[PDB]
Amino acid sequence: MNGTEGPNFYVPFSNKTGVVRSPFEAPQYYLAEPWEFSML
């Protein structure tokens, strides 16, 4: 959480992945809200 984005922008993977979680690691593990301010 912290943020979430959850509902929005074409599944919120679509936007700030490249920005915040560039490599990217998170998509393989948890397509939820890890990138959007959560960090966890």
Side-chain angles (χ1 to χ4, degrees):
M1 198 178 295
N2 305 343
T4 178
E5 259 196 46
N8 98 121
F9 197 81
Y10 313 104
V11 188
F13 161 91
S14 183
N15 47 10
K16 87 301 291 175
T17 38
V19 182
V20 186
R21 300 290 282 261
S22 326
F24 39 74
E25 20 62 282
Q28 287 72 220
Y29 305 118
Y30 50 9
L31 292 163
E33 49 172 29
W35 351 265
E36 204 280 90
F37 186 22
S38 203
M39 311 315 185
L40 197 173

PDB file of all heavy atoms in Angstrom:
ATOM      1  N   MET A   1       0.840  -1.207   0.000  1.00  0.00           N
ATOM      2  CA  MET A   1       0.000   0.000   0.000  1.00  0.00           C
ATOM      3  C   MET A   1       0.874   1.255   0.000  1.00  0.00           C
ATOM      4  O   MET A   1       1.615   1.448  -0.957  1.00  0.00           O
ATOM      5  CB  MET A   1      -1.068  -0.082   1.105  1.00  0.00           C
ATOM      6  CG  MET A   1      -2.223   0.906   0.881  1.00  0.00           C
ATOM      7  SD  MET A   1      -3.561   0.842   2.100  1.00  0.00           S
ATOM      8  CE  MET A   1      -4.231  -0.812   1.814  1.00  0.00           C
ATOM      9  N   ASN A   2       0.804   2.102   1.033  1.00  0.00           N
ATOM     10  CA  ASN A   2       1.356   3.461   1.050  1.00  0.00           C
ATOM     11  C   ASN A   2       0.602   4.323   0.033  1.00  0.00           C
ATOM     12  O   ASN A   2      -0.154   5.212   0.418  1.00  0.00           O
ATOM     13  CB  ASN A   2       2.881   3.519   0.828  1.00  0.00           C
ATOM     14  CG  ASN A   2       3.692   2.671   1.803  1.00  0.00           C
ATOM     15  OD1 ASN A   2       3.202   2.253   2.847  1.00  0.00           O
ATOM     16  ND2 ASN A   2       4.950   2.403   1.465  1.00  0.00           N
ATOM     17  N   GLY A   3       0.775   4.018  -1.254  1.00  0.00           N
ATOM     18  CA  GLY A   3      -0.149   4.383  -2.314  1.00  0.00           C
ATOM     19  C   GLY A   3      -1.012   3.153  -2.597  1.00  0.00           C
ATOM     20  O   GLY A   3      -1.351   2.433  -1.659  1.00  0.00           O
ATOM     21  N   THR A   4      -1.335   2.887  -3.864  1.00  0.00           N
ATOM     22  CA  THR A   4      -1.895   1.622  -4.330  1.00  0.00           C
ATOM     23  C   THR A   4      -2.038   1.633  -5.856  1.00  0.00           C
ATOM     24  O   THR A   4      -1.572   0.715  -6.532  1.00  0.00           O
ATOM     25  CB  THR A   4      -3.220   1.248  -3.623  1.00  0.00           C
ATOM     26  OG1 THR A   4      -3.730   0.049  -4.162  1.00  0.00           O
ATOM     27  CG2 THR A   4      -4.314   2.320  -3.690  1.00  0.00           C
ATOM     28  N   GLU A   5      -2.749   2.626  -6.402  1.00  0.00           N
ATOM     29  CA  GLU A   5      -3.171   2.728  -7.801  1.00  0.00           C
ATOM     30  C   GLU A   5      -4.123   1.617  -8.297  1.00  0.00           C
ATOM     31  O   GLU A   5      -4.889   1.876  -9.226  1.00  0.00           O
ATOM     32  CB  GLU A   5      -1.971   2.910  -8.743  1.00  0.00           C
ATOM     33  CG  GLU A   5      -1.788   4.374  -9.186  1.00  0.00           C
ATOM     34  CD  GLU A   5      -0.870   4.480 -10.394  1.00  0.00           C
ATOM     35  OE1 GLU A   5      -1.084   3.683 -11.343  1.00  0.00           O
ATOM     36  OE2 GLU A   5       0.108   5.244 -10.353  1.00  0.00           O
ATOM     37  N   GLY A   6      -4.069   0.408  -7.719  1.00  0.00           N
ATOM     38  CA  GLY A   6      -4.893  -0.776  -7.972  1.00  0.00           C
ATOM     39  C   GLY A   6      -5.836  -0.722  -9.186  1.00  0.00           C
ATOM     40  O   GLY A   6      -5.524  -1.320 -10.211  1.00  0.00           O
ATOM     41  N   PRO A   7      -7.007  -0.069  -9.089  1.00  0.00           N
ATOM     42  CA  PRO A   7      -7.992  -0.047 -10.165  1.00  0.00           C
ATOM     43  C   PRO A   7      -7.498   0.563 -11.486  1.00  0.00           C
ATOM     44  O   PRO A   7      -7.990   0.193 -12.550  1.00  0.00           O
ATOM     45  CB  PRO A   7      -9.170   0.768  -9.620  1.00  0.00           C
ATOM     46  CG  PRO A   7      -9.051   0.612  -8.106  1.00  0.00           C
ATOM     47  CD  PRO A   7      -7.539   0.575  -7.897  1.00  0.00           C
ATOM     48  N   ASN A   8      -6.631   1.576 -11.417  1.00  0.00           N
ATOM     49  CA  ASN A   8      -6.468   2.542 -12.502  1.00  0.00           C
ATOM     50  C   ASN A   8      -5.506   2.089 -13.613  1.00  0.00           C
ATOM     51  O   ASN A   8      -4.921   1.008 -13.561  1.00  0.00           O
ATOM     52  CB  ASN A   8      -6.085   3.917 -11.924  1.00  0.00           C
ATOM     53  CG  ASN A   8      -4.583   4.189 -11.978  1.00  0.00           C
ATOM     54  OD1 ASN A   8      -4.154   5.162 -12.588  1.00  0.00           O
ATOM     55  ND2 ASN A   8      -3.786   3.311 -11.390  1.00  0.00           N
ATOM     56  N   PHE A   9      -5.349   2.968 -14.613  1.00  0.00           N
ATOM     57  CA  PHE A   9      -4.381   2.915 -15.706  1.00  0.00           C
ATOM     58  C   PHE A   9      -4.067   1.496 -16.187  1.00  0.00           C
ATOM     59  O   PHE A   9      -2.955   1.000 -16.016  1.00  0.00           O
ATOM     60  CB  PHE A   9      -3.119   3.720 -15.355  1.00  0.00           C
ATOM     61  CG  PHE A   9      -2.266   4.064 -16.563  1.00  0.00           C
ATOM     62  CD1 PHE A   9      -2.610   5.159 -17.379  1.00  0.00           C
ATOM     63  CD2 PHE A   9      -1.181   3.245 -16.922  1.00  0.00           C
ATOM     64  CE1 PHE A   9      -1.880   5.422 -18.551  1.00  0.00           C
ATOM     65  CE2 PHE A   9      -0.478   3.481 -18.117  1.00  0.00           C
ATOM     66  CZ  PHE A   9      -0.825   4.573 -18.929  1.00  0.00           C
ATOM     67  N   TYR A  10      -5.054   0.872 -16.838  1.00  0.00           N
ATOM     68  CA  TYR A  10      -4.870  -0.313 -17.669  1.00  0.00           C
ATOM     69  C   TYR A  10      -4.076  -1.410 -16.952  1.00  0.00           C
ATOM     70  O   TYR A  10      -3.183  -2.012 -17.544  1.00  0.00           O
ATOM     71  CB  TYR A  10      -4.210   0.099 -18.994  1.00  0.00           C
ATOM     72  CG  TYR A  10      -4.839   1.316 -19.646  1.00  0.00           C
ATOM     73  CD1 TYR A  10      -4.190   2.565 -19.584  1.00  0.00           C
ATOM     74  CD2 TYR A  10      -6.123   1.224 -20.214  1.00  0.00           C
ATOM     75  CE1 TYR A  10      -4.820   3.713 -20.092  1.00  0.00           C
ATOM     76  CE2 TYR A  10      -6.752   2.375 -20.721  1.00  0.00           C
ATOM     77  CZ  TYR A  10      -6.101   3.617 -20.663  1.00  0.00           C
ATOM     78  OH  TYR A  10      -6.723   4.728 -21.147  1.00  0.00           O
ATOM     79  N   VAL A  11      -4.420  -1.649 -15.680  1.00  0.00           N
ATOM     80  CA  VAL A  11      -3.670  -2.472 -14.738  1.00  0.00           C
ATOM     81  C   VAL A  11      -2.366  -1.739 -14.382  1.00  0.00           C
ATOM     82  O   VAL A  11      -1.479  -1.621 -15.227  1.00  0.00           O
ATOM     83  CB  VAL A  11      -3.427  -3.910 -15.246  1.00  0.00           C
ATOM     84  CG1 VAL A  11      -2.813  -4.768 -14.131  1.00  0.00           C
ATOM     85  CG2 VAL A  11      -4.735  -4.568 -15.704  1.00  0.00           C
ATOM     86  N   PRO A  12      -2.189  -1.271 -13.135  1.00  0.00           N
ATOM     87  CA  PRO A  12      -1.169  -0.289 -12.766  1.00  0.00           C
ATOM     88  C   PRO A  12       0.285  -0.789 -12.816  1.00  0.00           C
ATOM     89  O   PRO A  12       1.195  -0.057 -12.422  1.00  0.00           O
ATOM     90  CB  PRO A  12      -1.570   0.185 -11.369  1.00  0.00           C
ATOM     91  CG  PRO A  12      -2.334  -0.996 -10.791  1.00  0.00           C
ATOM     92  CD  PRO A  12      -3.076  -1.521 -12.012  1.00  0.00           C
ATOM     93  N   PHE A  13       0.515  -1.993 -13.343  1.00  0.00           N
ATOM     94  CA  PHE A  13       1.791  -2.413 -13.905  1.00  0.00           C
ATOM     95  C   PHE A  13       2.181  -1.463 -15.048  1.00  0.00           C
ATOM     96  O   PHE A  13       3.333  -1.056 -15.170  1.00  0.00           O
ATOM     97  CB  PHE A  13       1.628  -3.859 -14.411  1.00  0.00           C
ATOM     98  CG  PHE A  13       2.661  -4.329 -15.419  1.00  0.00           C
ATOM     99  CD1 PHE A  13       3.842  -4.964 -14.994  1.00  0.00           C
ATOM    100  CD2 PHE A  13       2.431  -4.138 -16.796  1.00  0.00           C
ATOM    101  CE1 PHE A  13       4.809  -5.355 -15.938  1.00  0.00           C
ATOM    102  CE2 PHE A  13       3.401  -4.523 -17.737  1.00  0.00           C
ATOM    103  CZ  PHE A  13       4.593  -5.126 -17.307  1.00  0.00           C
ATOM    104  N   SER A  14       1.203  -1.132 -15.893  1.00  0.00           N
ATOM    105  CA  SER A  14       1.378  -0.492 -17.189  1.00  0.00           C
ATOM    106  C   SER A  14       2.229   0.788 -17.129  1.00  0.00           C
ATOM    107  O   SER A  14       3.017   1.040 -18.038  1.00  0.00           O
ATOM    108  CB  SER A  14      -0.018  -0.270 -17.796  1.00  0.00           C
ATOM    109  OG  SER A  14       0.061   0.288 -19.092  1.00  0.00           O
ATOM    110  N   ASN A  15       2.076   1.605 -16.079  1.00  0.00           N
ATOM    111  CA  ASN A  15       2.780   2.882 -15.942  1.00  0.00           C
ATOM    112  C   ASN A  15       4.108   2.741 -15.182  1.00  0.00           C
ATOM    113  O   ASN A  15       5.156   2.572 -15.800  1.00  0.00           O
ATOM    114  CB  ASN A  15       1.860   3.984 -15.372  1.00  0.00           C
ATOM    115  CG  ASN A  15       1.051   3.553 -14.152  1.00  0.00           C
ATOM    116  OD1 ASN A  15       1.301   2.484 -13.599  1.00  0.00           O
ATOM    117  ND2 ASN A  15       0.102   4.366 -13.703  1.00  0.00           N
ATOM    118  N   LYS A  16       4.119   2.885 -13.850  1.00  0.00           N
ATOM    119  CA  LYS A  16       5.339   3.295 -13.145  1.00  0.00           C
ATOM    120  C   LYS A  16       6.334   2.162 -12.857  1.00  0.00           C
ATOM    121  O   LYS A  16       7.284   2.365 -12.103  1.00  0.00           O
ATOM    122  CB  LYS A  16       5.013   4.143 -11.898  1.00  0.00           C
ATOM    123  CG  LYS A  16       4.732   3.378 -10.593  1.00  0.00           C
ATOM    124  CD  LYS A  16       3.564   2.392 -10.672  1.00  0.00           C
ATOM    125  CE  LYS A  16       2.231   3.134 -10.793  1.00  0.00           C
ATOM    126  NZ  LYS A  16       1.113   2.199 -10.997  1.00  0.00           N
ATOM    127  N   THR A  17       6.153   0.983 -13.457  1.00  0.00           N
ATOM    128  CA  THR A  17       7.095  -0.122 -13.344  1.00  0.00           C
ATOM    129  C   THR A  17       8.472   0.342 -13.796  1.00  0.00           C
ATOM    130  O   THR A  17       9.403   0.403 -12.997  1.00  0.00           O
ATOM    131  CB  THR A  17       6.608  -1.272 -14.231  1.00  0.00           C
ATOM    132  OG1 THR A  17       6.061  -0.727 -15.420  1.00  0.00           O
ATOM    133  CG2 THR A  17       5.568  -2.103 -13.487  1.00  0.00           C
ATOM    134  N   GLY A  18       8.574   0.699 -15.078  1.00  0.00           N
ATOM    135  CA  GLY A  18       9.797   1.193 -15.695  1.00  0.00           C
ATOM    136  C   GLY A  18      10.469   2.272 -14.843  1.00  0.00           C
ATOM    137  O   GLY A  18      11.688   2.284 -14.693  1.00  0.00           O
ATOM    138  N   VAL A  19       9.665   3.179 -14.281  1.00  0.00           N
ATOM    139  CA  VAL A  19      10.157   4.280 -13.471  1.00  0.00           C
ATOM    140  C   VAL A  19      10.735   3.760 -12.150  1.00  0.00           C
ATOM    141  O   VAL A  19      11.921   3.939 -11.883  1.00  0.00           O
ATOM    142  CB  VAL A  19       9.034   5.314 -13.254  1.00  0.00           C
ATOM    143  CG1 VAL A  19       9.538   6.513 -12.440  1.00  0.00           C
ATOM    144  CG2 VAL A  19       8.491   5.827 -14.596  1.00  0.00           C
ATOM    145  N   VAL A  20       9.897   3.166 -11.296  1.00  0.00           N
ATOM    146  CA  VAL A  20      10.247   2.917  -9.900  1.00  0.00           C
ATOM    147  C   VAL A  20      10.954   1.569  -9.729  1.00  0.00           C
ATOM    148  O   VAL A  20      11.838   1.433  -8.887  1.00  0.00           O
ATOM    149  CB  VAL A  20       8.992   3.016  -9.011  1.00  0.00           C
ATOM    150  CG1 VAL A  20       9.368   2.901  -7.525  1.00  0.00           C
ATOM    151  CG2 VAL A  20       8.268   4.355  -9.215  1.00  0.00           C
ATOM    152  N   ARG A  21      10.533   0.556 -10.490  1.00  0.00           N
ATOM    153  CA  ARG A  21      10.992  -0.821 -10.366  1.00  0.00           C
ATOM    154  C   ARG A  21      11.484  -1.278 -11.738  1.00  0.00           C
ATOM    155  O   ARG A  21      10.987  -2.245 -12.310  1.00  0.00           O
ATOM    156  CB  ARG A  21       9.844  -1.693  -9.830  1.00  0.00           C
ATOM    157  CG  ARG A  21       9.321  -1.248  -8.453  1.00  0.00           C
ATOM    158  CD  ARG A  21      10.295  -1.508  -7.298  1.00  0.00           C
ATOM    159  NE  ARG A  21      10.290  -2.925  -6.891  1.00  0.00           N
ATOM    160  CZ  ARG A  21       9.619  -3.455  -5.856  1.00  0.00           C
ATOM    161  NH1 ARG A  21       8.727  -2.731  -5.176  1.00  0.00           N
ATOM    162  NH2 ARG A  21       9.858  -4.721  -5.515  1.00  0.00           N
ATOM    163  N   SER A  22      12.466  -0.546 -12.265  1.00  0.00           N
ATOM    164  CA  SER A  22      12.959  -0.642 -13.626  1.00  0.00           C
ATOM    165  C   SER A  22      13.431  -2.027 -14.101  1.00  0.00           C
ATOM    166  O   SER A  22      13.135  -2.362 -15.246  1.00  0.00           O
ATOM    167  CB  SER A  22      14.062   0.406 -13.803  1.00  0.00           C
ATOM    168  OG  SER A  22      13.747   1.550 -13.029  1.00  0.00           O
ATOM    169  N   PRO A  23      14.204  -2.797 -13.307  1.00  0.00           N
ATOM    170  CA  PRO A  23      14.959  -3.958 -13.775  1.00  0.00           C
ATOM    171  C   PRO A  23      14.300  -4.880 -14.811  1.00  0.00           C
ATOM    172  O   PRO A  23      14.920  -5.142 -15.838  1.00  0.00           O
ATOM    173  CB  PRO A  23      15.434  -4.692 -12.520  1.00  0.00           C
ATOM    174  CG  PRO A  23      15.662  -3.530 -11.557  1.00  0.00           C
ATOM    175  CD  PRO A  23      14.523  -2.567 -11.902  1.00  0.00           C
ATOM    176  N   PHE A  24      13.096  -5.426 -14.610  1.00  0.00           N
ATOM    177  CA  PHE A  24      12.178  -5.289 -13.489  1.00  0.00           C
ATOM    178  C   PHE A  24      12.097  -6.625 -12.751  1.00  0.00           C
ATOM    179  O   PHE A  24      12.094  -7.679 -13.385  1.00  0.00           O
ATOM    180  CB  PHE A  24      10.808  -4.844 -14.029  1.00  0.00           C
ATOM    181  CG  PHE A  24      10.361  -5.475 -15.340  1.00  0.00           C
ATOM    182  CD1 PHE A  24       9.923  -6.814 -15.394  1.00  0.00           C
ATOM    183  CD2 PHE A  24      10.410  -4.718 -16.527  1.00  0.00           C
ATOM    184  CE1 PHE A  24       9.501  -7.376 -16.610  1.00  0.00           C
ATOM    185  CE2 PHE A  24       9.974  -5.276 -17.742  1.00  0.00           C
ATOM    186  CZ  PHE A  24       9.514  -6.603 -17.784  1.00  0.00           C
ATOM    187  N   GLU A  25      12.034  -6.594 -11.419  1.00  0.00           N
ATOM    188  CA  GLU A  25      11.928  -7.776 -10.573  1.00  0.00           C
ATOM    189  C   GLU A  25      10.454  -8.042 -10.253  1.00  0.00           C
ATOM    190  O   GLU A  25       9.959  -9.155 -10.438  1.00  0.00           O
ATOM    191  CB  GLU A  25      12.788  -7.623  -9.297  1.00  0.00           C
ATOM    192  CG  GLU A  25      13.191  -6.197  -8.876  1.00  0.00           C
ATOM    193  CD  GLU A  25      12.001  -5.318  -8.544  1.00  0.00           C
ATOM    194  OE1 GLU A  25      11.373  -4.843  -9.514  1.00  0.00           O
ATOM    195  OE2 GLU A  25      11.672  -5.164  -7.347  1.00  0.00           O
ATOM    196  N   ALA A  26       9.755  -7.008  -9.782  1.00  0.00           N
ATOM    197  CA  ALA A  26       8.432  -7.105  -9.192  1.00  0.00           C
ATOM    198  C   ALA A  26       7.427  -7.898 -10.036  1.00  0.00           C
ATOM    199  O   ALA A  26       6.753  -8.767  -9.482  1.00  0.00           O
ATOM    200  CB  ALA A  26       7.924  -5.711  -8.804  1.00  0.00           C
ATOM    201  N   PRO A  27       7.303  -7.648 -11.352  1.00  0.00           N
ATOM    202  CA  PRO A  27       6.362  -8.356 -12.208  1.00  0.00           C
ATOM    203  C   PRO A  27       6.425  -9.880 -12.090  1.00  0.00           C
ATOM    204  O   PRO A  27       5.393 -10.538 -12.184  1.00  0.00           O
ATOM    205  CB  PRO A  27       6.663  -7.881 -13.631  1.00  0.00           C
ATOM    206  CG  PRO A  27       7.147  -6.454 -13.383  1.00  0.00           C
ATOM    207  CD  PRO A  27       8.006  -6.645 -12.137  1.00  0.00           C
ATOM    208  N   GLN A  28       7.615 -10.452 -11.874  1.00  0.00           N
ATOM    209  CA  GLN A  28       7.742 -11.897 -11.740  1.00  0.00           C
ATOM    210  C   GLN A  28       7.143 -12.411 -10.426  1.00  0.00           C
ATOM    211  O   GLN A  28       6.815 -13.591 -10.332  1.00  0.00           O
ATOM    212  CB  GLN A  28       9.213 -12.323 -11.849  1.00  0.00           C
ATOM    213  CG  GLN A  28       9.767 -12.230 -13.280  1.00  0.00           C
ATOM    214  CD  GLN A  28      10.004 -10.815 -13.807  1.00  0.00           C
ATOM    215  OE1 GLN A  28       9.740 -10.528 -14.970  1.00  0.00           O
ATOM    216  NE2 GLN A  28      10.539  -9.926 -12.979  1.00  0.00           N
ATOM    217  N   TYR A  29       7.049 -11.557  -9.400  1.00  0.00           N
ATOM    218  CA  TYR A  29       6.754 -11.973  -8.034  1.00  0.00           C
ATOM    219  C   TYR A  29       5.360 -11.541  -7.584  1.00  0.00           C
ATOM    220  O   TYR A  29       4.655 -12.323  -6.951  1.00  0.00           O
ATOM    221  CB  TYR A  29       7.840 -11.426  -7.099  1.00  0.00           C
ATOM    222  CG  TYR A  29       9.248 -11.826  -7.503  1.00  0.00           C
ATOM    223  CD1 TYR A  29      10.191 -10.844  -7.859  1.00  0.00           C
ATOM    224  CD2 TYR A  29       9.584 -13.188  -7.621  1.00  0.00           C
ATOM    225  CE1 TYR A  29      11.449 -11.223  -8.359  1.00  0.00           C
ATOM    226  CE2 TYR A  29      10.842 -13.566  -8.122  1.00  0.00           C
ATOM    227  CZ  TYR A  29      11.770 -12.582  -8.500  1.00  0.00           C
ATOM    228  OH  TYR A  29      12.985 -12.939  -9.004  1.00  0.00           O
ATOM    229  N   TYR A  30       4.971 -10.294  -7.865  1.00  0.00           N
ATOM    230  CA  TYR A  30       3.762  -9.707  -7.300  1.00  0.00           C
ATOM    231  C   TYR A  30       3.223  -8.542  -8.136  1.00  0.00           C
ATOM    232  O   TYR A  30       3.441  -7.373  -7.824  1.00  0.00           O
ATOM    233  CB  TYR A  30       3.941  -9.369  -5.804  1.00  0.00           C
ATOM    234  CG  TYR A  30       5.155  -8.583  -5.315  1.00  0.00           C
ATOM    235  CD1 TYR A  30       6.079  -7.970  -6.186  1.00  0.00           C
ATOM    236  CD2 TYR A  30       5.321  -8.423  -3.927  1.00  0.00           C
ATOM    237  CE1 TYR A  30       7.140  -7.204  -5.672  1.00  0.00           C
ATOM    238  CE2 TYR A  30       6.355  -7.619  -3.418  1.00  0.00           C
ATOM    239  CZ  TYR A  30       7.245  -6.977  -4.295  1.00  0.00           C
ATOM    240  OH  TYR A  30       8.088  -6.001  -3.849  1.00  0.00           O
ATOM    241  N   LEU A  31       2.449  -8.863  -9.176  1.00  0.00           N
ATOM    242  CA  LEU A  31       1.684  -7.892  -9.953  1.00  0.00           C
ATOM    243  C   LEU A  31       0.510  -7.352  -9.122  1.00  0.00           C
ATOM    244  O   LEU A  31      -0.645  -7.633  -9.429  1.00  0.00           O
ATOM    245  CB  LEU A  31       1.176  -8.555 -11.246  1.00  0.00           C
ATOM    246  CG  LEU A  31       2.293  -8.897 -12.242  1.00  0.00           C
ATOM    247  CD1 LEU A  31       1.779  -9.915 -13.265  1.00  0.00           C
ATOM    248  CD2 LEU A  31       2.768  -7.643 -12.986  1.00  0.00           C
ATOM    249  N   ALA A  32       0.807  -6.587  -8.068  1.00  0.00           N
ATOM    250  CA  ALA A  32      -0.189  -5.992  -7.182  1.00  0.00           C
ATOM    251  C   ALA A  32      -0.009  -4.471  -7.143  1.00  0.00           C
ATOM    252  O   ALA A  32      -0.512  -3.776  -8.021  1.00  0.00           O
ATOM    253  CB  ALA A  32      -0.105  -6.661  -5.804  1.00  0.00           C
ATOM    254  N   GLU A  33       0.713  -3.962  -6.141  1.00  0.00           N
ATOM    255  CA  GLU A  33       0.980  -2.544  -5.938  1.00  0.00           C
ATOM    256  C   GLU A  33       2.415  -2.259  -5.433  1.00  0.00           C
ATOM    257  O   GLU A  33       2.634  -1.212  -4.828  1.00  0.00           O
ATOM    258  CB  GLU A  33      -0.077  -2.021  -4.950  1.00  0.00           C
ATOM    259  CG  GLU A  33      -0.195  -2.922  -3.707  1.00  0.00           C
ATOM    260  CD  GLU A  33      -1.086  -2.320  -2.633  1.00  0.00           C
ATOM    261  OE1 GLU A  33      -2.012  -1.565  -2.998  1.00  0.00           O
ATOM    262  OE2 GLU A  33      -0.803  -2.611  -1.449  1.00  0.00           O
ATOM    263  N   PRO A  34       3.421  -3.125  -5.662  1.00  0.00           N
ATOM    264  CA  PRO A  34       4.726  -2.985  -5.019  1.00  0.00           C
ATOM    265  C   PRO A  34       5.463  -1.724  -5.488  1.00  0.00           C
ATOM    266  O   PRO A  34       6.214  -1.106  -4.734  1.00  0.00           O
ATOM    267  CB  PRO A  34       5.487  -4.255  -5.396  1.00  0.00           C
ATOM    268  CG  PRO A  34       4.913  -4.605  -6.764  1.00  0.00           C
ATOM    269  CD  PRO A  34       3.441  -4.260  -6.574  1.00  0.00           C
ATOM    270  N   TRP A  35       5.278  -1.364  -6.759  1.00  0.00           N
ATOM    271  CA  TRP A  35       5.967  -0.250  -7.396  1.00  0.00           C
ATOM    272  C   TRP A  35       5.417   1.089  -6.900  1.00  0.00           C
ATOM    273  O   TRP A  35       6.174   2.027  -6.662  1.00  0.00           O
ATOM    274  CB  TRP A  35       5.877  -0.358  -8.933  1.00  0.00           C
ATOM    275  CG  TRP A  35       5.315  -1.625  -9.512  1.00  0.00           C
ATOM    276  CD1 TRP A  35       6.026  -2.692  -9.942  1.00  0.00           C
ATOM    277  CD2 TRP A  35       3.912  -1.978  -9.712  1.00  0.00           C
ATOM    278  NE1 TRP A  35       5.167  -3.671 -10.396  1.00  0.00           N
ATOM    279  CE2 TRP A  35       3.850  -3.280 -10.289  1.00  0.00           C
ATOM    280  CE3 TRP A  35       2.685  -1.337  -9.440  1.00  0.00           C
ATOM    281  CZ2 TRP A  35       2.635  -3.902 -10.610  1.00  0.00           C
ATOM    282  CZ3 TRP A  35       1.461  -1.957  -9.746  1.00  0.00           C
ATOM    283  CH2 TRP A  35       1.433  -3.229 -10.342  1.00  0.00           C
ATOM    284  N   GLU A  36       4.090   1.198  -6.789  1.00  0.00           N
ATOM    285  CA  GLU A  36       3.448   2.468  -6.489  1.00  0.00           C
ATOM    286  C   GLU A  36       3.556   2.747  -4.992  1.00  0.00           C
ATOM    287  O   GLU A  36       2.651   2.422  -4.225  1.00  0.00           O
ATOM    288  CB  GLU A  36       2.004   2.476  -7.018  1.00  0.00           C
ATOM    289  CG  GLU A  36       1.515   3.912  -7.263  1.00  0.00           C
ATOM    290  CD  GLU A  36       1.070   4.608  -5.989  1.00  0.00           C
ATOM    291  OE1 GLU A  36       1.940   5.247  -5.360  1.00  0.00           O
ATOM    292  OE2 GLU A  36      -0.128   4.470  -5.657  1.00  0.00           O
ATOM    293  N   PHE A  37       4.704   3.290  -4.570  1.00  0.00           N
ATOM    294  CA  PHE A  37       4.942   3.867  -3.245  1.00  0.00           C
ATOM    295  C   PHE A  37       5.078   2.801  -2.144  1.00  0.00           C
ATOM    296  O   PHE A  37       5.784   3.017  -1.162  1.00  0.00           O
ATOM    297  CB  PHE A  37       3.886   4.953  -2.950  1.00  0.00           C
ATOM    298  CG  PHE A  37       4.006   5.786  -1.682  1.00  0.00           C
ATOM    299  CD1 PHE A  37       5.227   5.954  -1.000  1.00  0.00           C
ATOM    300  CD2 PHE A  37       2.867   6.480  -1.231  1.00  0.00           C
ATOM    301  CE1 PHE A  37       5.276   6.708   0.187  1.00  0.00           C
ATOM    302  CE2 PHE A  37       2.912   7.231  -0.045  1.00  0.00           C
ATOM    303  CZ  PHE A  37       4.116   7.336   0.672  1.00  0.00           C
ATOM    304  N   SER A  38       4.435   1.643  -2.297  1.00  0.00           N
ATOM    305  CA  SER A  38       4.512   0.515  -1.382  1.00  0.00           C
ATOM    306  C   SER A  38       5.969   0.114  -1.115  1.00  0.00           C
ATOM    307  O   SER A  38       6.373  -0.011   0.042  1.00  0.00           O
ATOM    308  CB  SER A  38       3.677  -0.637  -1.958  1.00  0.00           C
ATOM    309  OG  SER A  38       3.277  -1.534  -0.941  1.00  0.00           O
ATOM    310  N   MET A  39       6.756  -0.081  -2.181  1.00  0.00           N
ATOM    311  CA  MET A  39       8.135  -0.564  -2.164  1.00  0.00           C
ATOM    312  C   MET A  39       8.186  -2.039  -1.770  1.00  0.00           C
ATOM    313  O   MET A  39       8.659  -2.865  -2.552  1.00  0.00           O
ATOM    314  CB  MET A  39       9.085   0.299  -1.315  1.00  0.00           C
ATOM    315  CG  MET A  39       8.984   1.802  -1.605  1.00  0.00           C
ATOM    316  SD  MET A  39       8.926   2.295  -3.350  1.00  0.00           S
ATOM    317  CE  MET A  39       8.978   4.090  -3.173  1.00  0.00           C
ATOM    318  N   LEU A  40       7.672  -2.373  -0.587  1.00  0.00           N
ATOM    319  CA  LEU A  40       7.257  -3.730  -0.293  1.00  0.00           C
ATOM    320  C   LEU A  40       6.156  -4.056  -1.303  1.00  0.00           C
ATOM    321  O   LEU A  40       5.087  -3.414  -1.215  1.00  0.00           O
ATOM    322  CB  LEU A  40       6.788  -3.817   1.167  1.00  0.00           C
ATOM    323  CG  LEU A  40       6.706  -5.252   1.719  1.00  0.00           C
ATOM    324  CD1 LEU A  40       6.404  -5.190   3.221  1.00  0.00           C
ATOM    325  CD2 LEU A  40       5.631  -6.101   1.029  1.00  0.00           C
TER     326      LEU A  40
END
